[PDB]
Each structure stands twice: as structure tokens, then as C-alpha cells.
Amino acid sequence: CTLSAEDKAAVERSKMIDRNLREDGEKAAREVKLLLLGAGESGKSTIVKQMKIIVKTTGIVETHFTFKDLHFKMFDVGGQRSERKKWIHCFEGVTAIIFCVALSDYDLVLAEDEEMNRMHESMKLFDSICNNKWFTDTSIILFLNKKDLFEEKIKKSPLTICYPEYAGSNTYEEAAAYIQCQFEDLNKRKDTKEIYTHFTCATDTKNVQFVFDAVTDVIIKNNLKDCGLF
Amino acid sequence: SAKELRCQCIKTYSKPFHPKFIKELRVIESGPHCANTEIIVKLSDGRELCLDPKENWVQRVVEKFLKRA
Amino acid sequence: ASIAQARKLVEQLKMEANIDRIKVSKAAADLMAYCEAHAKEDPLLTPVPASENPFRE
Amino acid sequence: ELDQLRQEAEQLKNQIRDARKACADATLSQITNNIDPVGRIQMRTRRTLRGHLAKIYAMHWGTDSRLLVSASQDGKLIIWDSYTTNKVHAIPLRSSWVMTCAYAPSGNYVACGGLDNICSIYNLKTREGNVRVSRELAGHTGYLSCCRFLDDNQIVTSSGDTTCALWDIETGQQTTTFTGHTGDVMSLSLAPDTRLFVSGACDASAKLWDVREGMCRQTFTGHESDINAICFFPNGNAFATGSDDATCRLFDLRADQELMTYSHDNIICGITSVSFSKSGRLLLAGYDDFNCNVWDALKADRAGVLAGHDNRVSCLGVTDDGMAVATGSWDSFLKIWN
Amino acid sequence: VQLVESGGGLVQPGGSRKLSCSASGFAFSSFGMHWVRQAPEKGLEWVAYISSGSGTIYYADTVKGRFTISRDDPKNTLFLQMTSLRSEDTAMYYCVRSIYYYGSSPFDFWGQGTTLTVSSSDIVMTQATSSVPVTPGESVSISCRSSKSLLHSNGNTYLYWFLQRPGQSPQLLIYRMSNLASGVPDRFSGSGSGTAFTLTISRLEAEDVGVYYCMQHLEYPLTFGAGTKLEL
Amino acid sequence: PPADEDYSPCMLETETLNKYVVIIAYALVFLLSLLGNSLVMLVILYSRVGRSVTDVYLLNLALADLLFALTLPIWAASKVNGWIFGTFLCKVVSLLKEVNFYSGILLLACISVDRYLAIVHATRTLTQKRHLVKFVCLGCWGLSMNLSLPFFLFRQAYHPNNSSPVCYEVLGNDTAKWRMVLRILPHTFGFIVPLFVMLFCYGFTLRTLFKAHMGQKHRAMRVIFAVVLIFLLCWLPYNLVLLADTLMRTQVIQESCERRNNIGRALDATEILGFLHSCLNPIIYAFIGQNFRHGFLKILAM
């Protein structure tokens, strides 16, 4: 085959190298990658400590936690002191995007300016990601954390201070339901992506169960397009 | 001239009659189309009959007609 | 305070006003004369046959 | 006050802006209009390098023009072999996110950047047949975008904190910090003489630094949006910038002004990587509309489009002696055109 | 890095033993290991080859069938089994490593050697010079003519020069040609022509005395050449 | 001598109008198959980028129907003019028709296994479709090759008396008895096993699609019902009349000349529905996929 002894032996090294990529490419597909959004004190450090089994990486902090024979990944993007859109192309193809909203920020004013409340700050943050050109197929697993403080604060502080047009009472059963109504309607596509809302507690262990019940939905939907069924 | 084919005759008639009552005789063997041998005797009026070659007097008639004709 | 950050800009920007600039026509003349001199040594200009092409197939 | 001091800087921009107009006696088109057109240049994919399983983010040819390094987001950095498709090395990275790579001029080291702002430098030609990190160069504060070697003991790194640094390899500390940018740097290129280098930032400005003293010499402001790629002329006398505005604007270093812009009505999509060909005549640019156009460096006319990729075209590269033009798209295949 | 091996002894003809090569200091999985013998009064002879992962295995003509080679990657050892050995194998064996890619240097490091004693189409390469006298300070030229064109069609021409100082194991000097090994001074310089090749030394010292062996690698089996000693 | 008609044999009617449609039907089905099936093969090869696991099955399944298309004109010419082609040609084309008759159907059950792993086994636990795709496709073709051997070996186009030659099965005097064992293969491996695999594999994907809430899961809830119904609509009627012919051969159901001609017409007419699945195959598998259509438009633009 007009090949020398060294050239023939070099190709034996190529496919032995190649086989180690293939035998590792099957492990990356099973891997699930999950970006995390939200502010630095809006419950970012709360849900990440529920289940974590695994300081020079000041850029991206990662958490290799796993659950029910599935290795999840967790790229908390908080150390990127630049525009979100700059590296947002680098995170294309991520399976989901966990998004956190602090429920007790209605009466909390922004630190640098006496306006633009944290929810309203997250209002444009949600739009910049949920309606982003690249982020169209990545479902947003949205969580409602810090729910153990919202119910006892609206007794004396009505929610109408945040939303100028509220038109409702201060019952947690409907106040929580009313708030999530806008969040699920903020997407420009109502079928390409879906928002898996969940009113998590401060000690509940079902959060990892919930994200498992939403990531499996993405994999099914991701595989349905490939097989041609959907 | 088809896709499926089976035996021509299914039921046989086994009563004696006039040996020279039939003018034209059709001889059918048992090849790959049928599992048994069948014979065809027909009168000019338009009725055709199939016999059972295993029967006693059926056998003695078929060869006799060929020898005569 | 914050004036110090803006202070260092003006002295730095002064050096950009001292660098000599030749006419753009002279720069363009060298920019086009360089290409024609090396036009014979660039194989992306004139495609080469399969003999001296190392990426044969 | 601050306004009075800033007004001095405001008026300081006037003379240099006026000097450029006073020096613009004749444009490039009307001095080179009497030139022979290059014509259609059709190129065919000679090789396809299909080892990766993720998005190719960068590549860099070696000095020998045969070995080729390429890094994708699947945490692999495969040292290819352009002539015969073989993976000489498969280097497993410590972090999955990488946005650049480099290949040493001697060939002993490969340097990979990343989104974890640590420039990890690998060693290839060593005892024991392994490929281990020779050093990790921490010290940046944002992310790392593009890093090149001056020699085996020096490296120049771009960053996301609007700072370009110059490291040493035997030690771990820096040497000089090229500060002065407002927007962060996305790509840079070292001059052929390896004495000056320009970096294309995110504020429509490219600066001409020097590696001796450590401060900018000339700044160029001709673009409108962020400059997303940059590369020197093969003679070290000019450099071209491709920005998000789909315009490949070519500058120069002796007149300190914009020479020409290459924009077409049909293209609106941005630019991912611009790399000159040998002899500085074929300004190959890699757009993100799945194509890779080929612009003439002296005439605005186009040439053969190097299309064929199923996704964005992340990085290009033209070999040192100039046969091949390898492009790495976000589909996992490299295509070594010729 | 070292290649230490154990075995050997006094062997009756027709017996069967094992030779074990224990490797320590590198990545044994990525290296295609060899086996080279040396008679007490002769040059070098190739024995067997095993690639990485035991993919492909080659054997010499004289040991085909009765010699079995195997590697133990988790155990980091190299094994040779010799059966029905005769009295013509009263030679000690070297354990030689080699990695094959672009720009690599095969036969980089050699083992120490285990002495085994028994009581009673290929490329032919010859070196005309033998025990040529030399003095410290005068340049010396060694020629090793081949029998087949060693210049492959891809521009790579294979010829390895080895130096065997008295007492210890040989070491690599010049791989394919005009390339210096890793850890050798610049005094050595080799040139070739396709069939006739030449190794030139500018200056030499007391440690440069020894026996020089020229080996090709174009096609298995790969054959050494007769030794060319250096005389004071 | 009395008179009776219950013993009078009847002759196998061959209407001219009957053979008008048969030759016409074969040509149009071949024309549709040569276009729809070849187009699916045409699209996949040109792309070569992003070829997933299901792209291999569509490549083979389009290939299986493509080869089956070439056999259709061969059968058409012998429906009116008899099998004057020769003994050698009778054996070779019968082998070609039966290998893709099973690999065409076995792949339908083989794909259903693939769609069971991708959906029900959502978490990558028992997903063995990583690199086995090339091996499983070879097994599907490999199983079909050994299944069609009895058809290829002993099938001689001999000369029935007072009839045009037919590519009939030729063996010893037990042709009716021997064929009863041979009739099992089109049933035990053409219908039963493919149906058991298909309904079981699609029995659980419907469970997960019912118990999960995706984005517009109703479309996937419907395409599965379309392919299952067509398989039951196409091959089952052919097998029912084929199974019925066995009962009269073994003398279970009463035999009469009125149904003697009806079953012969029914077998040939319903066999057309069998060939119908070779033309609808690209429509309900390839063109219905979201990924395939966008790849198709790229080729047209170029």
C-alpha cells in the first residue's frame, strides 16, 4: 500500500488516539450542561448548595453534582465582568438555563440607584436571554427561591409598589400565581421553548428531583427532532 | 398464467356407467401443480367429470380408451 | 480622584500628534509595488499543478 | 476643572484628525485603478479533519506548515497533520471552554486560552512521550481571547479586561502590561519582525503597541461597531480589521489612517476571522453567514467564496509559505482549502 | 527513565523460559517496544516488535513461530517467551522502546540487557570499514552502504546510527539522517544519498570510542550492519 | 347416467381488463418509487454533515425500496406474456424481491427499537445506538439474505400444461405440503415478529409522550399513529388472504369454485397494497422529519 514502516505505524497511532475520543464522546453526550443565571445575592448560592458532590478558576465556577445516574454540570456565570452577549455565543448548545428570581425584592431598592428594582432589573435580564437570537431552543428552568420570606412581608408592604398596575390582593396563593403569569408570557416563542416554574422551599430536597424532571423533557424533545417524530 | 395454482378436481364420482359414453379424454398427471392424478371425461352436451384413479374400474377404463383411439 | 484617570490621557495623546505621517499615495504605491514583486511567489494567485502541490488529494 | 482638561483632549483629537485629511491626497482606488484584476479564484476542500465532536473555536498553523493545532469546546486539543490526516497528539484540557490556541514557532509548545482566563502552555517534544503542562500563566481578571508566541520564552496574551500582557516562560510573572483600551480585546496579531503588534478591541479601535517600552504608538478609529478580528500585512506595514459591520477595513502604519473598506450589499452578517494570504493580495475573511468570502486587498472586487461549511466559520489561517488556507467551522470539521 | 530487565542463566537446548522487561519512567502504553540481541562476538540482530495496544506484531525470520512476545499495559511489563531454543541463541537481549509519529525519534532509549547462555528479501546493509584507527582531534568519516533505496516516496529517508560504548548499552545518535538525537552534542553530523550514507564527526574525545551500527527502518524485518570499531 | 355439476372443474379466468390495470399499476408504482426513494438517497449523501443515527436507517430503507423498484418492471412483463425470460432469470429476481421484502419490513421494526431507546430511555442509560447502527443495519440485511435462500435455490420457471410459463416454485411431488412450511417465513418474520417489536416499542413511547409535557408533543403523538396504522393497513390484508389460502390447501374451509377465482383475484389485488408501502415510505419517514426538509432545501438552492 505504498506506505513505509513508520508511516504505517503512525496511522496505527492515529486510530488508537481516535478510539479514545470516541470512547469519551459517548461520555460527553450523556453529560448534561446547565448554565445558571441570576444576581449574586438573588439565591445564586442557595440552590447550588442543595446537592453538590464533586479558587484559581475565578472566571467560571463549576459544580459536578449528579443525581439518579445522570452527571449534571453547573457553570455559574458570575465572574464574567463584561457584556453578557460577548461570551453568550460560547454557551450555545447548553441543555438548559436555570434562572433564579428572589421573591422578596419587590420592596428592595437597587444599591447604586434609587430605582430599577431587582425584579425589574431581572425583567430586562430575562428578555435579553429568553428572547436572545442564539438562545431559542434552550428551555429556561426557572425557580422561585426565597419563598420563606415573601409571605410574611406582604402583610404590611403591598406588592403594588413594584408593579404600578397590580389589581389584586396580597394572598400568597394568588400573588405567586400572578407573578409567574408574566414570566411564562415573556418569551416570543410559545412552543420552541418552555419555562418549568417551581416554587422551591428553603429546605426541600425536591429541587434536584424537579430539575431532573425538566432536563429529561429537554432530552426527549431534543431527540424527537432528530428522529423526525417532532 | 397466474401466481397461484391448485388441483383441478376435488370431488370424484364413483358409479359404473357406459365405457364408450365419452368421446374426448383429458389426461392429467401429478407433477408440481397437484398432489394427485386426475382424469377428465366430458360429453358433447357440456358436462365434465373427474374420476378417482385409485378405484378399481376407473383404472381399467382410461388405458382402454387410449388404446382404442 | 477621577480627574487622575482623565489626566493621563492628554499627555499620552500628545505623542500621537508628534508622529510623522507620510502621504497616503506614497504608502499606497509601496503597498501595491510589494504585491507585484511577491506575486510570483504566492501559490494562491496562480494555481499550481499536482506535482509541487503537497495537498495532492 | 475636568471639563477644561477634557476639552484639551477634545481639541487634541482635531489636529490628528485634520492631519489624516491633509495627508489623504489620493485614495487607493484611483492610484491602483490601472491594475489587472485577479479574477475568480475557486478553491476546493483538499482535506477534511473530522476528529472533534464539538465546535471548533480556534486553530493555528505551525512554522513547518505541516503540523496543525486546533481546539474545540469538548475539552480536547488535537495536533493534526495537514498532509496526511493523522492525530499526532490528543491533549485533554483542564477546562472545557477554550477560545484560542497557538503553536510555537519552534514547535515545542502549544498554548491554549480559555474562558477561565488561564493560559495553559503545553510541552510536546519531551522525554517520557507525554504532553504535560509546562506552565499555567494566571494573572488576568476577565477571560482570555487570543495568545501568540514571540519565541519559546515569551508570549503575548489578549484578555477581557482591556489589557494585553507579555509573559515570561521560565518564570511566572509578567513583563509589561499594554493598557489603554476602553473595550476588551478580542484578537491580535504579531508583526513578521515580532516587534510591534496590533489588537482589535470592542470599541471600534485598534492600537499599534510595541514590545520594548510597553505603550501604544498609533490608534485607529474608522470602524463603527466592535472589531472582531485582525491580522497584519505580510510585510509588517499594514493590517486589516474585520468587524461586526461586515466591513473588512484595511489600515496602514506609516500614514495612520484607514486605507479602504470592503463591504457588499448582500452581506449583512458579521465577521469572525480575517487573515491575509501570502504576498498580501487575497484578504480572506471568514463571515458568520456560513460562508468565507475572498476579498482582493487592493481592489474592492470579490472573488471565489470558500463556502461549504454547515455552521459559522470560527477561525482561518494561511500557511507560512502559502499553499493552504485552513478554516475551522463550528461543525466539528476543519477544511484545509488550497 | 530506565528499562531494567531480569532473566537469563544456563539453559539446556530445547528448553523454554521467559524474559521480562519492567519499564518505569514513561508512558508504556504509547510506546511500540522492540527486542534486540547481541552475540558475544557479533553485532546486533532484531528479534520482535509489538505496537501500542498489541495491535500489530512482527517477528524476525530466525525466531518466527518459536518466539512469542506480549505486553502487559496495566502491569507495565514486556514479555518474551522462547520455546525450543537452540544453541545458536547464546546471546544477551536488549529491550528497546520506540514511538512512531511525525517528528518522533524511534529507538530513543535502550535497556540494560540480560545474558542468556545455552550449553551445547530483506535489506542487507554492510560497512566496509572495521576497527579503523583514529586520534583525538582528527575528523573521522564512516560509510554504511545499503542494498535498497532507503529514500521513501514521501521525502523521508530512514537510517539510524547507534553508538555502543564498551561495557554499556548502545544509545541513539542520528535518527533518519541529519537529525541529532535528544541529548547528544552537535559534533556528530550525518549525510546520505539514498544508497550510500556517511557519518562525519568533527571533533572527538576519549568517550567517543566504541562501535557504530547503522540500521534502516524502511520495511520489516529491519537489519543492522556489521560493527565498525574505533581504534586509538 | 345422471347429471350433476358439483364435480365439474372450472378454468382460472384471466380477464383482459384485469391485466390492463396490473401492468399499468406496476409501472406507476415503479415510477413513484424510483423518484421518492432515490430522492431520499440523493439528499443524505450530499450533506455528510450532522449524519445522526436515524440517517443511516433512512439511507438503507430508501436503498431497500430502491432495489425493490427495479424488480417491479420484471414482474409486470410476465403477468400477460408469461415468464419467457428463462429459468436463470426466475431465480435471481425472486431473490432480489424477497431480501428487500424482509429488510424493508425488518428495518421498520428496527427503527422502532431505535425510537424506543431515544424517547423512553431518555436518560442515557441503555442507549446502545451509539456506534451499533452500522452493525444493526448489517444484521437486518444479513437476516434477510438467509431468509430468501429457499426462494432462490429451488424456483424453476417450468412449463405448466396449457398455460404460459410462470416463475413458480419447483420441488418434489409435495409442492403443496412443502410450501406450507415456507409460508411461515412471510408470516413469522414478515408480520408477527415485526408487529410484536413495533407495538411493544411504540407501546412505551406513547406512555412517555402521554405522561410528559413537551413543546408541541401532539405532532409526535400523531406521526407514530400514522406509521403504525399504515403498516396494519398494508401488510395485514395481504397476510389475511395468504393465510386463508392455507386453510383450503389443508382442507379446513369448504372449497368452491366461486371463491376459487375470488381468492386468486384477491391475492393479486391485495398484493398491490404491499407494493404501496414502498412509495409511501419516503413520505411518512423522510419528508415528515423537520431536519430532512431543511437539508432538502439546501440541496435545491445549490
Instruction: Kindly list the residues from chain E whose CB atom is less than 8 angstroms away from the CB atom of residue A17.
Output: none
Picking from E114, E93, E116, the residue whose alpha carbon sits closest to that of residue E33 is: E93
Q: Is F182 left (phi over 0), alpha (psi -120 to 50) or beta?
A: alpha
Q: In this structure, are residues C17 and D8 in contact, taking their beta carbons and an 8 Å threshold? A: no
F102 three-state secondary structure: helix
Is E202 exposed, middle or buried, given 0-12, 13-18 or 19+ CB atoms closer than 10 A? exposed
Would you tell me the crossing angle of helices F16-47 and F257-276 to the nearest 10 degrees? 20
Q: How far is E148 from chain D (nearest CA, A)?
A: 25
Is E122 exposed, middle or buried, given 0-12, 13-18 or 19+ CB atoms closer than 10 A? middle
Residue D108 to residues C45, D63, D103, Cα–Cα distance (Å): 32, 11, 8
Q: In this structure, are residues E181 and E175 in contact, taking their beta carbons and an 8 Å threshold? A: yes
H helix or E strand, kind and range, residue D200: strand D196-201
Q: Looking at chain D, which residue has its C-alpha nearest residue F49?
A: D310
Q: Which grid cell is F13?
A: 379466468
Give the dihedral sign, CA A209/A215/A216/A221.
positive
H helix or E strand, kind and range, residue F5: none
Q: Which grid cell is B20?
A: 364408450
Q: Return d(Cα F178, Cα F184) in angstroms, integer.
A: 11
| Number of Cα atoms under 13 Å in the Cβ half of residue C31 | 31
Q: Looking at chain E, which residue has its C-alpha nearest residue A11?
A: E101
What's the CATH superfamily of F16-301? Rhodopsin 7-helix transmembrane proteins (1.20.1070.10)
Q: How far is A90 from chain D (nearest CA, A)?
A: 8
Q: What is the CATH number of domain E2-118?
A: 2.60.40.10
Q: In this structure, are residues D307 and D291 in contact, taking their beta carbons and an 8 Å threshold? A: yes
DSSP-derived secondary structure letter, A108: P
Q: In this structure, are residues D170 and D153 in contact, taking their beta carbons and an 8 Å threshold? A: yes
Q: Which grid cell is B60?
A: 381399467
CB atoms within 10 A of CB F143: 15
Q: Looking at chain F, which residue has its C-alpha nearest residue A212?
A: F123
- Print burial letters for F245-270: b (CB count within 10 Å at least 16), e (below 16): beebbeeeeeeeeeebeebbebbbbb
Residue D88 to residues D48, D125, D149, E99, F121, Cα–Cα distance (Å): 16, 12, 21, 11, 37
Q: Return d(Cα E46, Cα E67) in angstroms, integer.
A: 12
Q: What is the DSSP string of D276-315?
A: E-GGG-EEEEEESSS---EEESSSS---------SS-EEE
Q: Which grid cell is D43?
A: 478553491
Binding site, annotated residues of A: 41-46, 55-57, 76-80, 145-148, 202
HEC secondary structure over chain E: CEEEEECCEEECCCCEEEEEEEEECCCHHHCCEEEEEECCCCCCEEEEEECHHHCCEEECCCCCCCEEEEEECCCCEEEEEEECCCHHHCCEEECECCCCCCCCCCCCCECCCECEEECCCCCCCECCCCCEECCCCCCEEEECECCCCCECCCCCECCEEEEECCCCCCEEEEECCCEECCCCCCCEEEEECCCCEEEEECCCCHHHCCEEEEECCCCCCCCCCCCEEEEC
Q: What's the one-letter identity of residue F186?
A: P
Mark yes or no for CB contact E220/A12 under 8 Å: no
Q: In this structure, are residues D92 and A27 in contact, taking their beta carbons and an 8 Å threshold? A: no
Technique used: cryo-EM
Q: Return d(Cα A135, Cα D159) in angstroms, integer.
A: 25
Mark yes or no for CB contact E26/D130 under 8 Å: yes
| Number of Cα atoms under 13 Å in the Cβ half of residue B56 | 2
Query: CB contact, 8 Å: F272 with chain A?
Result: no
Q: Which domains does chain A have, with CATH numbers?
A: 1-230 (3.40.50.300)
Mark yes or no for CB contact D26/C25 under 8 Å: yes
β-strand pairing of D89-92 with D101-103: unpaired
Q: Looking at chain A, which residue has its C-alpha nearest residue D53?
A: A25
Picking from D273, D246, D251, D275, the residue whose alpha carbon sits closest to that of residue D262 is: D246
Q: How far is E73 from chain A (nearest CA, A)?
A: 14
Binding site, annotated residues of A for GTP: 41-46, 55-57, 76-80, 145-148, 202
Query: CB contact, 8 Å: F212 with chain A?
Result: yes
Domain ranges of chain F: 16-301
How remote is the C-alpha of E129 from its chain's centroid?
19
How remote is the C-alpha of E111 from its chain's centroid?
10
Q: Which residue in the set D86, D95, D143 is minimally distant from A87, CB to CB?
A: D143
| Grid cell 520455546 in the structure block, residue | E83
Q: How far is D55 from chain A (nearest CA, A)?
A: 9
Residue-range definition of the domain harbouring residue D119: 2-337
Q: Return d(Cα F246, Cα F181) in angstroms, integer.
A: 10
Mark yes or no for CB contact E26/D67 under 8 Å: no
Instruction: Kindly list the residues from chain A whose CB atom is less than 8 angstroms away from the CB atom of residue F217.
Output: 221, 224, 230
Q: Which residue in the set F53, F288, F291 is minimally distant from A225, CB to CB?
A: F291
Give the dihedral sign, CA E164/E165/E171/E175.
negative
A93 three-state secondary structure: coil
| Number of Cα atoms under 13 Å in the Cβ half of residue A140 | 29
Q: Return d(Cα F44, Cα F60) in angstroms, integer.
A: 11
Q: Looking at chain E, which residue has its C-alpha nearest residue A4?
A: E218
Structural domains counted in chain D:
1
Q: In this structure, are residues A72 and A50 in contact, taking their beta carbons and an 8 Å threshold? A: no
Mark yes or no for CB contact B17/F1 under 8 Å: yes
Q: In this structure, are residues A113 and A50 in contact, taking their beta carbons and an 8 Å threshold? A: no
Q: CA A76, A81, A86: angle at the middle one, nearest 5?
A: 85
Q: What's the one-letter identity of residue D171?
A: T
Instruction: Kindly list the residues from chain E whose CB atom is less than 8 angstroms away from the CB atom of residue D128.
Output: 1, 25-27
Q: Return d(Cα D237, Cα D224) in angstroms, integer.
A: 23
Q: Which grid cell is E117?
A: 547462555
Q: Which grid cell is F151?
A: 426462494
Would you tell me the crossing angle of helices F16-47 and F290-301 to the nearest 10 degrees? 80
Q: Looking at chain A, which residue has its C-alpha nearest residue F212?
A: A217
> Any residues with CB less than 8 A from the CB of A171 and at least 6 apart, and which?
none
Q: How far is B27 from chain F (nearest CA, A)?
A: 11
> Any residues with CB less than 8 A from the CB of D103 and at least 6 apart, and which?
D60, D61, D62, D63, D67, D68, D69, D110, D149
Q: Is B42 left (phi over 0), alpha (psi -120 to 50) or beta?
A: beta
Q: How far is F94 from chain A (nearest CA, A)?
A: 33
Omega within 30 of 0 (cis) for the link into F186: no
D 308-337 residues with CB < 8 A to F: 310, 331, 333
Q: Which residues pair with D260 in a beta bridge?
A: D250
Instruction: Kindly list the residues from chain D whose CB atom is less than 8 angstroms away from the CB atom of residue A13.
Output: 86-87
Q: In this structure, are residues D48 and C48 in contact, taking their beta carbons and an 8 Å threshold? A: no
D 145-204 residues with CB < 8 A to F: none
Q: Which grid cell is D295?
A: 476579498
Q: Which residue in the set A28, A59, A81 is minimally distant from D53, CB to CB?
A: A28
Q: Which grid cell is A218?
A: 429537554
Q: What's the one-letter identity of residue D13?
A: K
Mark yes or no for CB contact E31/D130 under 8 Å: no
